Each structure stands twice: as C-alpha cells, then as structure tokens.
Design an enzyme around this catalytic site. Structure first.
Site, PDB file in Angstrom:
ATOM      1  N   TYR A  45       0.766  -1.227   0.000  1.00  0.00           N
ATOM      2  CA  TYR A  45       0.024   0.240   0.007  1.00  0.00           C
ATOM      3  C   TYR A  45       0.752   1.282  -0.032  1.00  0.00           C
ATOM      4  O   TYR A  45       2.257   1.380   0.352  1.00  0.00           O
ATOM      5  CB  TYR A  45      -0.978   0.065   1.299  1.00  0.00           C
ATOM      6  N   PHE A  55       2.994  11.031   3.644  1.00  0.00           N
ATOM      7  CA  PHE A  55       2.828   9.939   2.639  1.00  0.00           C
ATOM      8  C   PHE A  55       3.422   8.949   3.475  1.00  0.00           C
ATOM      9  O   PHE A  55       4.244   9.012   4.271  1.00  0.00           O
ATOM     10  CB  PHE A  55       3.656  10.365   1.432  1.00  0.00           C
ATOM     11  N   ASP A  56       3.001   7.489   3.027  1.00  0.00           N
ATOM     12  CA  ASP A  56       3.698   6.375   3.480  1.00  0.00           C
ATOM     13  C   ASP A  56       3.398   5.201   2.734  1.00  0.00           C
ATOM     14  O   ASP A  56       2.416   4.986   1.975  1.00  0.00           O
ATOM     15  CB  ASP A  56       2.815   6.150   5.003  1.00  0.00           C
ATOM     16  N   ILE A  75      -7.203   0.463  11.097  1.00  0.00           N
ATOM     17  CA  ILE A  75      -8.720   1.353  11.004  1.00  0.00           C
ATOM     18  C   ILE A  75      -9.731   0.557  10.350  1.00  0.00           C
ATOM     19  O   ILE A  75      -9.566  -0.224   9.349  1.00  0.00           O
ATOM     20  CB  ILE A  75      -8.391   2.428  10.154  1.00  0.00           C
ATOM     21  N   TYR A 101      -9.217   7.863  11.933  1.00  0.00           N
ATOM     22  CA  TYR A 101      -8.829   8.100  13.111  1.00  0.00           C
ATOM     23  C   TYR A 101      -9.749   9.290  14.004  1.00  0.00           C
ATOM     24  O   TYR A 101      -9.363   9.890  15.026  1.00  0.00           O
ATOM     25  CB  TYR A 101      -7.398   8.659  12.982  1.00  0.00           C
ATOM     26  N   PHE A 118      -5.914   5.722   0.260  1.00  0.00           N
ATOM     27  CA  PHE A 118      -4.684   4.750  -0.206  1.00  0.00           C
ATOM     28  C   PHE A 118      -5.176   3.959  -1.533  1.00  0.00           C
ATOM     29  O   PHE A 118      -6.037   3.695  -1.748  1.00  0.00           O
ATOM     30  CB  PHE A 118      -5.142   3.444   0.820  1.00  0.00           C
TER      31      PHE A 118
END
Ligand SMILES: COc1cc2cc(OC)c1OCCOC[C@@H](C)OC(=O)[C@@H]1CCCCN1C(=O)[C@H]2C1CCCCC1
Length: 128
Positions: A45, A55-56, A75, A101, A118
C-alpha cells in the site's frame, strides 16, 4: 487526481451508505474468494492524508504489510475495504475520519478529522 476520481466515481462500500469508505478497483484480481474475518492478509500500500503531505508506503520497509482481518489491528476502513478485495486486486480507497482516526486523530502523525487516501494491492490471504 486519484482521490478526486474516487470522490467522483467511487462505490460506497459502507453498510450505512454514508460515503465513509469509497472504492475504485484499479487492477481486477483473480478467483472469486475474498478474505473472511480472522484471515491473515498480505498487502502492499501507499497512503497519504487527503489534503497534505504525510505520505507512507509498505514499499519503504522492503516487505508486505500483514494483519489479521477484522481483528482490531487497522482502521475500520481497512477491515471494510480489504474484505471486498480479491487476490491480485489493486484498489483505491478514500476514507472519511469516522472510519479512520476520528475527531481525536492520532497526533502528532494524524490530525483531527483527517480524510485518508490509499492505494492497496492484495497480495495474499491465508486462514487462521
Ligand atoms: C497511526 O499510525 C500509523 C498510521 C499509518 C502507518 C503507521 O506506521 C507505518 C502508523 O504507525 C504505526 C501504527 O499502525 C498503523 C495502523 C493503525 O494503520 C492503519 O490502520 C492504516 C492502514 C494500514 C496501513 C497503515 N495505516 C495508516 O493509517 C498509516 C497512515 C496513512 C496516511 C499517511 C500517514 C500514515
């Protein structure tokens, strides 16, 4: 961009039909099986905050992101969305704060009332 396209065209996969989790399939997967609660799930992802630049990526750590579906670990939008996906599928999810969240956020990383985006690839899922 990709988030706005999801707003525009994405399917509402919430029970309540509140547009809290919107999905577009980007590469169709294989077979018909989708994961069940309790399945061990393997994904790649890339995520970010809707408006802004945290960003991740799983790719940043070398390896797949692994979790047990429906078992508290991610989540709510992921328990919902990943459950709809097939082995090999790539999808886009746009997520309101209520399925992420919330009003609390997860500071300092995630602000209050944050919308998330995502891109998810479902690599595999195996039984408990
Ligand atoms: C709030 O804390 C984090 C959030 C993200 C990534 C984090 O570390 C890589 C992270 O710290 C470790 C905690 O575990 C994350 C679980 C709850 O994460 C999720 O439920 C979702 C779905 C699974 C992938 C990670 N994701 C996130 O919310 C990221 C977040 C996406 C938006 C850009 C900022 C990171």
């Amino acid at each position: 961009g990709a988030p706005a396209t999801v707003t525009e065209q994405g399917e509402d996969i919430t029970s309540k039909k509140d547009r809290g989790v919107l999905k577009i399939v980007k590469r169709v997967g294989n077979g018909e099986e989708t994961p069940m609660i309790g399945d061990k799930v393997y994904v790649h992802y890339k995520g970010k905050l809707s408006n802004g630049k945290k960003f991740d990526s799983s790719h940043d750590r070398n390896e797949p992101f692994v979790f047990s579906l429906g078992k508290g670990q991610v989540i709510k939008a992921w328990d919902i969305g990943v459950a709809t996906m097939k082995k090999g599928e790539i999808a886009h999810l746009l997520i309101k704060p209520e399925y992420a969240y919330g009003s609390a956020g997860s500071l300092p990383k995630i602000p209050s009332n944050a919308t998330l985006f995502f891109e998810i690839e479902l690599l595999d899922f195996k039984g408990e």
